[PDB]
Design a protein around this motif. Sequence first.
Motif, PDB file in Angstrom:
ATOM      1  N   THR B  90       0.612  -0.780  -0.209  1.00  0.00           N
ATOM      2  CA  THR B  90      -0.011  -0.053  -0.159  1.00  0.00           C
ATOM      3  C   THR B  90       0.639   1.455  -0.291  1.00  0.00           C
ATOM      4  OG1 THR B  90      -0.033  -0.032   2.489  1.00  0.00           O
ATOM      5  CG2 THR B  90      -1.620  -1.460   1.084  1.00  0.00           C
ATOM      6  N   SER B  91      -0.094   2.178  -0.725  1.00  0.00           N
ATOM      7  CA  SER B  91       1.397   3.419  -0.255  1.00  0.00           C
ATOM      8  C   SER B  91       0.484   4.763  -0.349  1.00  0.00           C
ATOM      9  CB  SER B  91       1.813   3.768  -1.548  1.00  0.00           C
ATOM     10  OG  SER B  91       2.803   4.716  -1.585  1.00  0.00           O
ATOM     11  N   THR B  92       0.303   5.837   0.689  1.00  0.00           N
ATOM     12  CA  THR B  92      -0.453   7.182   0.899  1.00  0.00           C
ATOM     13  C   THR B  92       0.845   8.022  -0.093  1.00  0.00           C
ATOM     14  OG1 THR B  92      -1.283   5.660   2.476  1.00  0.00           O
ATOM     15  CG2 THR B  92      -1.644   8.778   1.710  1.00  0.00           C
ATOM     16  N   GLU B  93      -0.058   8.963  -0.840  1.00  0.00           N
ATOM     17  CA  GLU B  93       0.498   9.838  -1.608  1.00  0.00           C
ATOM     18  C   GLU B  93      -0.066  11.151  -1.707  1.00  0.00           C
ATOM     19  OE1 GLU B  93       1.152   7.698  -5.145  1.00  0.00           O
ATOM     20  OE2 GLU B  93       2.331   6.170  -3.353  1.00  0.00           O
ATOM     21  N   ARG B  94       1.065  12.363  -1.738  1.00  0.00           N
ATOM     22  CA  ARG B  94       0.881  13.574  -1.550  1.00  0.00           C
ATOM     23  C   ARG B  94       0.605  14.376  -2.293  1.00  0.00           C
ATOM     24  NH1 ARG B  94       2.777  18.783  -0.011  1.00  0.00           N
ATOM     25  NH2 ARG B  94       0.872  20.181   1.413  1.00  0.00           N
ATOM     26  N   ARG B 115       9.262  -0.422   0.985  1.00  0.00           N
ATOM     27  CA  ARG B 115      10.366  -0.362   0.950  1.00  0.00           C
ATOM     28  C   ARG B 115      10.554   1.740   0.839  1.00  0.00           C
ATOM     29  NH1 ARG B 115      12.615  -6.151   0.241  1.00  0.00           N
ATOM     30  NH2 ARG B 115      12.051  -7.129   2.408  1.00  0.00           N
ATOM     31  N   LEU B 116      10.129   2.423  -0.124  1.00  0.00           N
ATOM     32  CA  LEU B 116      10.651   3.612  -0.259  1.00  0.00           C
ATOM     33  C   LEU B 116      10.431   4.764   0.480  1.00  0.00           C
ATOM     34  CD1 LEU B 116       9.463   2.996  -3.909  1.00  0.00           C
ATOM     35  CD2 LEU B 116      11.387   2.646  -3.090  1.00  0.00           C
ATOM     36  N   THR B 117      10.614   4.560   1.897  1.00  0.00           N
ATOM     37  CA  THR B 117      10.685   5.946   2.298  1.00  0.00           C
ATOM     38  C   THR B 117      11.566   7.025   2.221  1.00  0.00           C
ATOM     39  OG1 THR B 117      12.837   5.378   4.126  1.00  0.00           O
ATOM     40  CG2 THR B 117      10.911   4.248   4.766  1.00  0.00           C
ATOM     41  N   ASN B 118      10.416   8.190   1.834  1.00  0.00           N
ATOM     42  CA  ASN B 118      10.460   9.345   2.134  1.00  0.00           C
ATOM     43  C   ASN B 118      11.195   9.408   0.494  1.00  0.00           C
ATOM     44  OD1 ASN B 118      10.651  10.974   4.416  1.00  0.00           O
ATOM     45  ND2 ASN B 118      12.829  10.038   4.521  1.00  0.00           N
ATOM     46  N   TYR B 119       9.914   8.555  -0.764  1.00  0.00           N
ATOM     47  CA  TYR B 119      10.188   8.912  -1.891  1.00  0.00           C
ATOM     48  C   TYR B 119       9.516  10.413  -2.396  1.00  0.00           C
ATOM     49  CZ  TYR B 119       9.037   8.074  -6.794  1.00  0.00           C
ATOM     50  OH  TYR B 119       9.525   7.315  -7.610  1.00  0.00           O
ATOM     51  N   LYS B 120      10.304  11.480  -3.479  1.00  0.00           N
ATOM     52  CA  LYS B 120       9.406  11.947  -3.774  1.00  0.00           C
ATOM     53  C   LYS B 120      10.211  11.998  -5.145  1.00  0.00           C
ATOM     54  CE  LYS B 120      10.752  15.129   0.129  1.00  0.00           C
ATOM     55  NZ  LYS B 120       9.700  14.069   1.509  1.00  0.00           N
TER      56      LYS B 120
HETATM   57  C1  LIG Z   1       8.992   4.018  -7.697  1.00  0.00           C
HETATM   58  C2  LIG Z   1       7.316   4.493  -7.638  1.00  0.00           C
HETATM   59  C3  LIG Z   1       6.677   5.108  -6.670  1.00  0.00           C
HETATM   60  C4  LIG Z   1       5.780   5.389  -6.339  1.00  0.00           C
HETATM   61  C5  LIG Z   1       5.058   5.333  -7.540  1.00  0.00           C
HETATM   62  C6  LIG Z   1       3.403   5.746  -7.411  1.00  0.00           C
HETATM   63  S1  LIG Z   1       2.700   4.340  -7.216  1.00  0.00           S
HETATM   64  O1  LIG Z   1       2.403   3.553  -7.933  1.00  0.00           O
HETATM   65  O2  LIG Z   1       1.061   5.223  -7.107  1.00  0.00           O
HETATM   66  N1  LIG Z   1       2.635   3.905  -5.750  1.00  0.00           N
HETATM   67  C7  LIG Z   1       3.223   2.905  -5.505  1.00  0.00           C
HETATM   68  C8  LIG Z   1       4.265   3.576  -4.397  1.00  0.00           C
HETATM   69  C9  LIG Z   1       4.598   2.564  -3.526  1.00  0.00           C
HETATM   70  C10 LIG Z   1       5.655   1.541  -4.431  1.00  0.00           C
HETATM   71  C11 LIG Z   1       6.793   0.566  -4.144  1.00  0.00           C
HETATM   72  N2  LIG Z   1       7.728  -0.022  -3.366  1.00  0.00           N
HETATM   73  C12 LIG Z   1       5.356   1.405  -5.948  1.00  0.00           C
HETATM   74  C13 LIG Z   1       5.362   0.239  -6.644  1.00  0.00           C
HETATM   75  C14 LIG Z   1       5.429  -0.209  -7.786  1.00  0.00           C
HETATM   76  C15 LIG Z   1       4.765  -0.910  -7.183  1.00  0.00           C
HETATM   77  C16 LIG Z   1       3.910   2.044  -6.784  1.00  0.00           C
HETATM   78  C17 LIG Z   1       5.223   4.786  -8.867  1.00  0.00           C
HETATM   79  C18 LIG Z   1       6.750   4.657  -8.697  1.00  0.00           C
END
Ligand SMILES: Cc1ccc(CS(=O)(=O)Nc2ccc(C#N)c(C3CC3)c2)cc1
Lengths: 173, 173
Positions: B90-94, B115-120
């Motif tokens: 799961t991912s919550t995004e702003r 596993r993508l902390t502080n991804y921007k």
């Molecule tokens: C590398 C990256 C991070 C975030 C996104 C936007 S998203 O695809 O809507 N959400 C998301 C968030 C974290 C991760 C991880 N790890 C992913 C993985 C690609 C499945 C998607 C697209 C690509």
Amino acid sequence: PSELTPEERSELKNSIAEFHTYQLDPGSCSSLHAQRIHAPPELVWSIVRRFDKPQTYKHFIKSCSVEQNFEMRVGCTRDVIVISGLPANTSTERLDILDDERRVTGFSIIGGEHRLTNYKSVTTVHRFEKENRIWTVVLESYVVDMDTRMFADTVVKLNLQKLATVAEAMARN
Amino acid sequence: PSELTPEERSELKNSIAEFHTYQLDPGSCSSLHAQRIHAPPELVWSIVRRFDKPQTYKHFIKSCSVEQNFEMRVGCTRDVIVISGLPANTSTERLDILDDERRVTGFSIIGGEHRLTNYKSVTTVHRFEKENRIWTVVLESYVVDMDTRMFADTVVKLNLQKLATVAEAMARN
Ligand SMILES: Cc1ccc(CS(=O)(=O)Nc2ccc(C#N)c(C3CC3)c2)cc1
Ligand SMILES: Cc1ccc(CS(=O)(=O)Nc2ccc(C#N)c(C3CC3)c2)cc1
């Protein structure tokens, strides 16, 4: 062709003179169409040279049959059945030219229930390179007896677009 | 970006300096990716600016939810559920930036099981014109904490390719 850049038209002048210029027989109609394709020319050629499988790069074909132990060489034929709802039902077509080295192929309609008597088509595939980019232009021309030009032009245009879509799908990294 | 032509790199130098250069925080990882798209930039932008619908131009998304009476403005959020079989659930995004006039948008991950902390991420869309041709280049960069770069680069690359496929399908004449 109004889609080509000036540079593309300049580099294709030779090919147009060589393969796409006609001595028009009495009572005819001819046109040249171009399609830019963002895929390697060897890939584009591998698709369009398959005389036995036009349904894989053309619209409007319900089925295409060739004889048992088919061999793709000049003079071989294909039997096309058109999808319903068009001004054509069937077409028998002959492979007129196959030049794998120069990427030229062409066919003629030799029978069937349709309104395109003495239709003959020539297709050529062209490599373009500039800096680190490689792309393709396809040229297709036809001549046909005697609305007619509008119908034939629109079909040729749509089929070149399908060819582009197929090649670009195959070329994705 | 090794796919851009010299002319494309020259015309994009300004945009890279303006929107895609980072003061790296301690312990990070950043990359810039480019995608050429054979469609008008206004069309490309209309697709990628839809923060609430990433599944329409990205891979790997099982579902994306936004709150009732959603309004797309900086600070709004989306809840992504990733398809099974990946290193993320799961991912919550702003939404961090939305600049329709300059065609810049960007988002941050603010929660979720991954596993993508502080991804921007920041995405920009660019018009190219030469003779009678109009095309687009999309630039997307990210920064993320701390194989990681290989996974994130490959996803960003595949998603830019999906964006290209969608825009080119919509642009067909
Ligand atoms: C590398 C990256 C991070 C975030 C996104 C936007 S998203 O695809 O809507 N959400 C998301 C968030 C974290 C991760 C991880 N790890 C992913 C993985 C690609 C499945 C998607 C697209 C690509
Ligand atoms: C204009 C034209 C003629 C022939 C072809 C090759 S084909 O599509 O395999 N056969 C074919 C033959 C005659 C006609 C007519 N009219 C058509 C119509 C496009 C359905 C297809 C493609 C386009």
